[PDB]
Amino acid sequence: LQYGPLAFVLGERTTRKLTETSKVITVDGNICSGKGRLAREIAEKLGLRHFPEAGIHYADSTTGDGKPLDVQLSGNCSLEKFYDDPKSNDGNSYRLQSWLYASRLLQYADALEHLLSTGQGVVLERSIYSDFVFLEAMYRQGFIRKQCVEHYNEVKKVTACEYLPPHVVVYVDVPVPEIQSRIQKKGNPHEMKITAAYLQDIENAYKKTFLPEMSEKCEVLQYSAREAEDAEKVVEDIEYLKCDKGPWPDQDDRTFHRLRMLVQNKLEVLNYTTIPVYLPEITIGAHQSDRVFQKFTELPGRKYSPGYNEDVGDKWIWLK
Amino acid sequence: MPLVYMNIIMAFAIALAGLLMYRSHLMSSLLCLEGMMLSLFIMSTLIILNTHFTLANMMPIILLVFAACEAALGLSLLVMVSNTYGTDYVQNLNLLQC
Amino acid sequence: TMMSGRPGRVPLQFLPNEARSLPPPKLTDPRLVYMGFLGYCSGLIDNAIRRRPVVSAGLHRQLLYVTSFVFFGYYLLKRQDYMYALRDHDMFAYVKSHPEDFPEKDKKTYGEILEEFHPVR
Amino acid sequence: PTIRLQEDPDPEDENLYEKNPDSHGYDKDPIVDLWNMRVVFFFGFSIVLVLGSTFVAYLPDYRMQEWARREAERLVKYREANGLPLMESNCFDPNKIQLPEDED
Amino acid sequence: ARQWQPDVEWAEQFGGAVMYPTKETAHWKPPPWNDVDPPKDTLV
Amino acid sequence: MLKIIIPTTMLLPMTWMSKHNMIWINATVHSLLISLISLSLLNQLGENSLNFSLTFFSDSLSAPLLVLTTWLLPLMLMASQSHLSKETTTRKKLYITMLILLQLFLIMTFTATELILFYILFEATLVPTLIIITRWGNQTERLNAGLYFLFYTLAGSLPLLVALVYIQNTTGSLNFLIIHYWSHPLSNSWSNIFMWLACIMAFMVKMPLYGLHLWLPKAHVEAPIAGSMVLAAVLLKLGGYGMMRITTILNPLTNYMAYPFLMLSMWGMIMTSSICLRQTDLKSLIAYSSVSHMALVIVAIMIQTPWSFMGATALMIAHGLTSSMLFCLANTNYERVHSRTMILARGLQTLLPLMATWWLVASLTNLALPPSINLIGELFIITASFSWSNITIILMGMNMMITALYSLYMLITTQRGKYTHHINNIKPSFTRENALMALHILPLLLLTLNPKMILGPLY
Amino acid sequence: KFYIREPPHGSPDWLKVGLTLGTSVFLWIYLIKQHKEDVLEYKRRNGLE
Amino acid sequence: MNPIIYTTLIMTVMSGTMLVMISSHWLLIWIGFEMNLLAMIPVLMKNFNPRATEAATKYFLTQATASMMLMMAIIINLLYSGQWTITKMFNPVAMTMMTMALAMKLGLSPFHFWVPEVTQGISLQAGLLLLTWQKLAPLSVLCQISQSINPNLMLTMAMLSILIGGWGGLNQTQLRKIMAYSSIAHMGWMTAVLPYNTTMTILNLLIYITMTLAMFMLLIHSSATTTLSLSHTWNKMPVITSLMMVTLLSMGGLPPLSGFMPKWMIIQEMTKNESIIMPTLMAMTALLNLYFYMRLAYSSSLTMFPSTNNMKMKWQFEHTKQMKLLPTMIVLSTLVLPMTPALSSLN
Numbered sequence A: 001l002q003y004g005p006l007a008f009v010l011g012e013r014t015t016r017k018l019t020e021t022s023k024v025i026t027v028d029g030n031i032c033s034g035k036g037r038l039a040r041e042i043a044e045k046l047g048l049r050h051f052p053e054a055g056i057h058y059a060d061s062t063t064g065d066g067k068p069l070d071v072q073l074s075g076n077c078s079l080e081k082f083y084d085d086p087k088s089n090d091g092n093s094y095r096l097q098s099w100l101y102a103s104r105l106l107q108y109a110d111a112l113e114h115l116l117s118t119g120q121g122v123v124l125e126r127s128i129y130s131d132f133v134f135l136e137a138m139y140r141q142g143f144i145r146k147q148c149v150e151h152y153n154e155v156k157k158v159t160a161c162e163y164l165p166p167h168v169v170v171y172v173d174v175p176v177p178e179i180q181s182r183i184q185k186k187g188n189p190h191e192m193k194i195t196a197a198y199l200q201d202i203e204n205a206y207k208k209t210f211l212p213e214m215s216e217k218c219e220v221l222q223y224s225a226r227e228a229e230d231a232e233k234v235v236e237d238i239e240y241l242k243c244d245k246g247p248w249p250d251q252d253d254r255t256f257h258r259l260r261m262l263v264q265n266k267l268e269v270l271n272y273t274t275i276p277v278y279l280p281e282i283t284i285g286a287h288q289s290d291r292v293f294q295k296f297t298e299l300p301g302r303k304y305s306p307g308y309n310e311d312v313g314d315k316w317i318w319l320k
Numbered sequence B: 001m002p003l004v005y006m007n008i009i010m011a012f013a014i015a016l017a018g019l020l021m022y023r024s025h026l027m028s029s030l031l032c033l034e035g036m037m038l039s040l041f042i043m044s045t046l047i048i049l050n051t052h053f054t055l056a057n058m059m060p061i062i063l064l065v066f067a068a069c070e071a072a073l074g075l076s077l078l079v080m081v082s083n084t085y086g087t088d089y090v091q092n093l094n095l096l097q098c
Numbered sequence C: 001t002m003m004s005g006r007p008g009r010v011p012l013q014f015l016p017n018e019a020r021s022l023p024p025p026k027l028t029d030p031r032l033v034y035m036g037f038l039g040y041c042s043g044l045i046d047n048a049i050r051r052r053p054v055v056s057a058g059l060h061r062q063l064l065y066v067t068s069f070v071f072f073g074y075y076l077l078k079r080q081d082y083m084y085a086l087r088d089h090d091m092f093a094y095v096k097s098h099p100e101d102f103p104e105k106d107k108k109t110y111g112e113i114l115e116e117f118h119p120v121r
Numbered sequence D: 001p002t003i004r005l006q007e008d009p010d011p012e013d014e015n016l017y018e019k020n021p022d023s024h025g026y027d028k029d030p031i032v033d034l035w036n037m038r039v040v041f042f043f044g045f046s047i048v049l050v051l052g053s054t055f056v057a058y059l060p061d062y063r064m065q066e067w068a069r070r071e072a073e074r075l076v077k078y079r080e081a082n083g084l085p086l087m088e089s090n091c092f093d094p095n096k097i098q099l100p101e102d103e104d
Numbered sequence E: 001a002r003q004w005q006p007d008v009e010w011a012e013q014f015g016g017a018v019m020y021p022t023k024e025t026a027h028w029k030p031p032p033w034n035d036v037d038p039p040k041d042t043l044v
Numbered sequence F: 001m002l003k004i005i006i007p008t009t010m011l012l013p014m015t016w017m018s019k020h021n022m023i024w025i026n027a028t029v030h031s032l033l034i035s036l037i038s039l040s041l042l043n044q045l046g047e048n049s050l051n052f053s054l055t056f057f058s059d060s061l062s063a064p065l066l067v068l069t070t071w072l073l074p075l076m077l078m079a080s081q082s083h084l085s086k087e088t089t090t091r092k093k094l095y096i097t098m099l100i101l102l103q104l105f106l107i108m109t110f111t112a113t114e115l116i117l118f119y120i121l122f123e124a125t126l127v128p129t130l131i132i133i134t135r136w137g138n139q140t141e142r143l144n145a146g147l148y149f150l151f152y153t154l155a156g157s158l159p160l161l162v163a164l165v166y167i168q169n170t171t172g173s174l175n176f177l178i179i180h181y182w183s184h185p186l187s188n189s190w191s192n193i194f195m196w197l198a199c200i201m202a203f204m205v206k207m208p209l210y211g212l213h214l215w216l217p218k219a220h221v222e223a224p225i226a227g228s229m230v231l232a233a234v235l236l237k238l239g240g241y242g243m244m245r246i247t248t249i250l251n252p253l254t255n256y257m258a259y260p261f262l263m264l265s266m267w268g269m270i271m272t273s274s275i276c277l278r279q280t281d282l283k284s285l286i287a288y289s290s291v292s293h294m295a296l297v298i299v300a301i302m303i304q305t306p307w308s309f310m311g312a313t314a315l316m317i318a319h320g321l322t323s324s325m326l327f328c329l330a331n332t333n334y335e336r337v338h339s340r341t342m343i344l345a346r347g348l349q350t351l352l353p354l355m356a357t358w359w360l361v362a363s364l365t366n367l368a369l370p371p372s373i374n375l376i377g378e379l380f381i382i383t384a385s386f387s388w389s390n391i392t393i394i395l396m397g398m399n400m401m402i403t404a405l406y407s408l409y410m411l412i413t414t415q416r417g418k419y420t421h422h423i424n425n426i427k428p429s430f431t432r433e434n435a436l437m438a439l440h441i442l443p444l445l446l447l448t449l450n451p452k453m454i455l456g457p458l459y
Numbered sequence G: 001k002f003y004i005r006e007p008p009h010g011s012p013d014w015l016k017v018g019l020t021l022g023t024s025v026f027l028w029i030y031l032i033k034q035h036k037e038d039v040l041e042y043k044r045r046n047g048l049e
Numbered sequence H: 001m002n003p004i005i006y007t008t009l010i011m012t013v014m015s016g017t018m019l020v021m022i023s024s025h026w027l028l029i030w031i032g033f034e035m036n037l038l039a040m041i042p043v044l045m046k047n048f049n050p051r052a053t054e055a056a057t058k059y060f061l062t063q064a065t066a067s068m069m070l071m072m073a074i075i076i077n078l079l080y081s082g083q084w085t086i087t088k089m090f091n092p093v094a095m096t097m098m099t100m101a102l103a104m105k106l107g108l109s110p111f112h113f114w115v116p117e118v119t120q121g122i123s124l125q126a127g128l129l130l131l132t133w134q135k136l137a138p139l140s141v142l143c144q145i146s147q148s149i150n151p152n153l154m155l156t157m158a159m160l161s162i163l164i165g166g167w168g169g170l171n172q173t174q175l176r177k178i179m180a181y182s183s184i185a186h187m188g189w190m191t192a193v194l195p196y197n198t199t200m201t202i203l204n205l206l207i208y209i210t211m212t213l214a215m216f217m218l219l220i221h222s223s224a225t226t227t228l229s230l231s232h233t234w235n236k237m238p239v240i241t242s243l244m245m246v247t248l249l250s251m252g253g254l255p256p257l258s259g260f261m262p263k264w265m266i267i268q269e270m271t272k273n274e275s276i277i278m279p280t281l282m283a284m285t286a287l288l289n290l291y292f293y294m295r296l297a298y299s300s301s302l303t304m305f306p307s308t309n310n311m312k313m314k315w316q317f318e319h320t321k322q323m324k325l326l327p328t329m330i331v332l333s334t335l336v337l338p339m340t341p342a343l344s345s346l347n
């Protein structure tokens, strides 16, 4: 039976599935750090589910098949164009920022739903609570205007207030010159165009706003490049923590029921992302909207409900 | 009608006007509602006793019971209003317009 | 309301036994056909809302829609016919019971009725 | 962005004669266009127009105009033979009409 | 060449608290997207 | 007469069940077949009407209108399949559904034997036309036009409903046969005057009258081609049919009450004919010509003589056909040039000779050339008005001159002269447009061969 | 295919399908029987046949 | 709020209105009104915010005042006749007090001021209950005592309600206030025919309830509470927009849609007894309601407003909780005109 008010009425509760090992873990670091491998190792050692960083096409991997869709149908933005031409006049930078924030919101909703329904913990690679560092980096470098950051702030205020912050925040601290050296050694032709001021602004926003704010609600475990390879040590520090300061121990069964009803039904999760605020970067005309929607509808498995598509081989349609 | 009935009716009318005037506070209007209820109770019991309607004697008591509910209800709302504004003033209840 | 208060009226019957003396509507009544059409339209709208192949998503659901609409429509038509028959019966009874208020007037022919003529010019 | 919308450019006119010299102006696909023209011409000019006009031209005389002419000939012949007036002013018999008794 | 469709300028007429804005209602603000006004800094 | 109504309700699902590239063919073929079937109602008794059932009856006035509507639908389908080529299948099917619903409502309107049912369908015709105008128009004014086209109707027709039910509470029935047989004179009183106004104003604004014509130019200009066709050819005749059906009870109050409406109709016919001369747009000229012709029809109905009724019916049919053809001719040029200005594209005779011939024939039939049915109706109305009063001819005569002027003016502005030197995208005329023009024009001559079919019941 | 469980499976929920079909059949036979009884009762009351 | 508490509060509201509608004693009717208000107050505050709190406060104050005057009318009627049965209620003063109290409970003008505000404050689910279910009890009480209703007062209040609803709806951009003003106009329409025939009142109530239900469930399906937010759903669920336009056309009163059936019938019922001016005024005023419905339809489906980029993601997700009775409500709200005579089954 799909979870709902009736399933909550008799039997199923949420607090009886938490086994003290929920520990929503968020790993944060500057561009081109070891945060991804650290997150994978933490998830493996602690037995939690690893959530890779939400990219442009994260939502494509949750619906239909995992194959990503065309950039025109999903995203309508690219990271390579942002790196090559950050000051473009088509509004690519803020469009990408808003799409990435929405993808991170969807991923956080998915992780919370999994944790509430199963009880096994999740390890994210970046949360919606730390997505604003890139926004501040773009704004300080002149990549985006002020109205874009105002719209982002409005969307964040109306969206992120409905969820619970991660139990413990893990930060990987890497100096800017080391980041530049790793970027140069990596080899991707587009990432070599990332200026030092961008990374410096990212790390300044991190250390000045994100960590001080998270210290008031969670436990922050800052690390370094050298100590980020021995994942056993960080696992021991995580498992020898005192989780008593956040709002998580202050949640009752009704609050968990409301949160579980909210995290599923992703339409309510993404409702406030498309507020009727008309910014030239994100607003799309009626004709292009109609053309792109018609193109999306003609996809092999997107015309009907996920179970009523004869194109992808569904059978017994006339009796479902 | 004797003067007692008209005095009770005048008391009810005065309480209704006082409720409808809404000076500054909210507790005053709740007091006006309770006064209207008291006037209704007195009128009803006088009418019942005068005509010797025996079964109707429990009618006023039920009245009083629901009065309490109304009072409780109002007080509850007042508390919330205070917790939102720090003051039970009716001037603050203006977020919604026509 | 005129028929709300009537002697010998059971409150919540919806179909008094006296209504059984009237001919039941035929199963091929056009109003029943329209009720079935309404059920079919409701089923099609249900298919459209859920993003399903509108014409042939669910045959059992559409069949249930049509059957429920026809089932309700049969009894609705029965009650409507009973109510109209009762109104006609009461009107005729009251007309018969008060002959002075509904007199039989004279039957004049147009040869003696004088109607003024209006030329068109 | 010194603009207001992410709008598509306005498309230019599509010419049906570019990819189809004999287009008939019905559709892009030549076969369905040719068949559309054929059915339009057959059911508009051949079936409906000519057959409908020849059916209307030969409708039976239900308006009763030949019958009225024959009746008029018979009545005129009879009335003129007997010397009666060809036409009578009173449409109805005065004997069947009862006027008011007096006008004072 | 194509049928006219509303743009941002045409859409912004339906964005205010009320239509037909007079001087008195010019300072009326539209309600928040979620029907939650920001908490007031009530010094108690 | 369900043999005509049911095939339309079967045209609906077959349109919704057709292939993506075969909707137009099926719709056109079966609409033409339905028109051929409906052509069988022209056999009318000279005594009384054909009463098929308790709800539907056909008279000598209803049959030409039914034939005109059933013939109209295929022409609208043919004219609509040019600007809708880029549309999606679902929206094309929706457009065809609107057209089919409009035809069905018109067919059931023209044959309803009860006045309340006639009102219900005569108002149900509003929804599809409004949807078409406000959804498939081109300019930003269409919405405004739609609003006008709605309210100018409803504010004139809401009182009528009240009058209708009031009549049913007084006479006891609203069936047309009972109404005609049991008709009684109306005394001179304020109550009867307002009853007359309520019964008349809806059909007056549906013609429209000169003072209430402001919605017509907007509706006819901002609508798509099929909307303009259906508005100017059949939707205008609803008011005339309603007045001709409803004037039976209004006597003898009509003779006193018709003076302001007759004066307005005559002077507004003159004014709109004069307005047609100084017009920078092309569709507005045709709209105002329609207004003038409908004002003439209003005069004919108001004077209430058999010759006037015959002329009114003939003029209604002829104007419907001619205005439809003119709107199609203007739409072809609009598709070529993507503008409605009259002086933009000039000298089109040297580039489109056959279209020039079609323009000439349409303009000739617009100015009442003998022996076309346009002149038959116009001359019958003129003779009836002259019998009504010998001075009226002056006004009528004036209109005639002005009419010819503006007609030829248009024919000279768009066809003669030299080309604009900078419009190089005037492709040769397609077969579809020429076929549409021929199917518009040939029935006019075929009818002027046998006019008694379109002269109404007074024949 | 679909990466998700597709709650509407490759086969219909035969319990609900059976319930709906049985409900439709029961309603239809009930309507038939009720109409037969009603016409018989009307004929008996009016004494026609 | 716990689901058990929510469902028991809803059941208590329904029990209160049942007690009102099945009781022959005046005191039991008053008790039912009190129970309905007491159990309805927390339903509005299910989602806690200052706007919901102040909407609940205004609703409670209005309902408490109405109950006070209702009980005073009952006591006066008892004073002038020792009768408790809900009956003719001969006394003019008591009848006037009861009429005013029931008008304020219903929201008729000039007691309409609370209707647009409260609807704005509460959630759509809460709003739907307030506009649809909270009208049965006062209308039932009015129907039972309709024969004693002074026609002048009732007709004046109904005409004022129609005019005020039509004028107020012209200005609002928020959907909830538009729905509230439409509800006020519809209440005026049904209240107008009450002294002449209560069957038409019941029929108009049923059709208005069906139309309002379909409207609100369609608004819940596409979670938009403003005109601009509703202008986006054409890019996500066009079928919802088309159904919404058809429902708005029906609510406007256009034939052959179902919404034309009550008005027409009401007009007919008012013409049987020499009331000509008033129905004409009502029709010409309801033209305003049609106008603002048409404006909403223009903004919603008949045109295509610009959309946003993030809407693309919404293209990949389906609506999870599906309302079962929405298609039936839509069908009964539009295609039910040809079954007009079945209204005879309402008496």
Ligand SMILES: CCCCCCCCCCCCCCCCCC(=O)OC[C@H](COP(=O)([O-])OCC(O)COP(=O)([O-])OC[C@@H](COC(=O)CCCCCCCCCCCCCCCCC)OC(=O)CCCCCCCCCCCCCCCCC)OC(=O)CCCCCCCCCCCCCCCCC
Residues within 6 Å of the ligand: A297, C041, C044, C045, C048, C052, C053, C054, C055, F009, F013, F016, F017, F090, F091, F094, F097, F101, F127, F128, F131, F135, H238, H239, H242, H243, H245, H246, H256, H257, H301, H302, H334, H335
């Ligand atoms: C008086 C006589 C009868 C007349 C009564 C009225 C008409 C009938 C009753 C109406 C209700 C029934 C159907 C309505 C629900 C259907 C939902 C729908 O959207 O249809 C799409 C659906 C196509 O979808 P699909 O095939 O799944 O794939 C394409 C995707 O859906 C892709 O879909 P998409 O979402 O991507 O497409 C986008 C589109 C999607 O949006 C829509 O398609 C609009 C949906 C219609 C609105 C529903 C209104 C509810 C009913 C009220 C009707 C009012 C009537 C009064 C007159 C006023 C009209 C407003 O949105 C737009 O384009 C926006 C444009 C704005 C236009 C504004 C106009 C909207 C209102 C029009 C209402 C006209 C009346 C309904 C006519 C039928 C329409 C299907 O159409 C159909 O295939 C089914 C149509 C009906 C099938 C009939 C077949 C019967 C059985 C076959 C055999 C026949 C007998 C054999 C025996 C022979 C003896 C051997």
Ligand SMILES: CCCCCCCCCCCCCCCCC[C@@H](O)O[C@H](CO[C@H](O)CCCCCCCCCCCCCCC)COP(=O)(O)OCC[N+](C)(C)C
Residues within 6 Å of the ligand: C001, C004, C010, C011, C012, C013, C014, C076, H202, H203, H206, H207, H210, H332, H336, H339, H340, H341, H342, H343, H345, H346, H347
């Ligand atoms: C506009 C569409 C409305 C549809 C309404 C919902 C339809 C489905 C709901 C199922 C219907 C069953 C409800 C009642 C059945 C059993 C209860 C029965 O005993 O009720 C009795 C009789 O039932 C009801 O009275 C009538 C119910 C019939 C409803 C249909 C009317 C719809 C209006 C006509 C438009 C056509 C709609 C077509 C619908 C498909 C009450 O008699 P009574 O105690 O003496 O009345 C006292 C109050 N009065 C006198 C003032 C009225």
Ligand SMILES: CCCCCCCCCCCCCCCCC[C@@H](O)O[C@H](CO[C@H](O)CCCCCCCCCCCCCCC)COP(=O)(O)OCC[N+](C)(C)C
Residues within 6 Å of the ligand: D048, D049, D052, D053, D056, D057, D058, F039, F064, F065, F067, F068, F071, F317, F443, F446, F447, F449, F450, F454
């Ligand atoms: C391109 C080249 C052009 C030039 C070449 C032309 C070649 C020669 C062709 C010219 C022919 C000369 C015409 C001479 C007239 C002959 C035909 C005429 O005499 O027939 C008429 C017949 O005319 C028809 O009646 C015309 C009927 C009109 C058809 C209606 C149009 C079809 C419907 C399509 C939809 C239109 C909608 C309109 C709404 C009403 C006479 O009718 P009538 O003398 O009395 O009855 C005769 C039969 N009776 C005596 C047994 C009774």
Ligand SMILES: CCCCCCCC/C=C\CCCCCCCC(=O)O[C@H](COC(=O)CCCCCCC/C=C/CCCCCCCC)COP(=O)(O)OCCN
Residues within 6 Å of the ligand: F151, F152, F153, F155, F156, F159, F162, F163, F166, F191, F192, F194, F195, F197, F198, F201, F205, F212, H274, H275, H276, H277, H280
């Ligand atoms: C495009 C906009 C056009 C607007 C046109 C609207 C005007 C229509 C004309 C008036 C309509 C209302 C008339 C009422 C309907 C007829 C019913 C009837 O005849 O009953 C009369 C009642 O007549 C009336 O009450 C009419 C009152 C009018 C009130 C509304 C006035 C509307 C505006 C008045 C001027 C409109 C006329 C000219 C308008 C021209 C267009 C601009 C008889 O009363 P009884 O009860 O039978 O008693 C008599 C025996 N003792």
Ligand SMILES: Nc1ncnc2c1ncn2[C@@H]1O[C@H](COP(=O)(O)OP(=O)(O)O)[C@@H](O)[C@H]1O
Residues within 6 Å of the ligand: A030, A031, A032, A033, A034, A035, A036, A053, A079, A096, A097, A100, A101, A131, A134, A135, A191
């Ligand atoms: N909100 C954002 N704005 C712009 N770019 C972002 C944003 N979020 C993530 N990215 C991009 O995602 C890329 C990959 O992230 P990163 O952790 O630095 O590399 P890796 O996956 O190898 O650890 C980075 O180049 C970063 O710029």
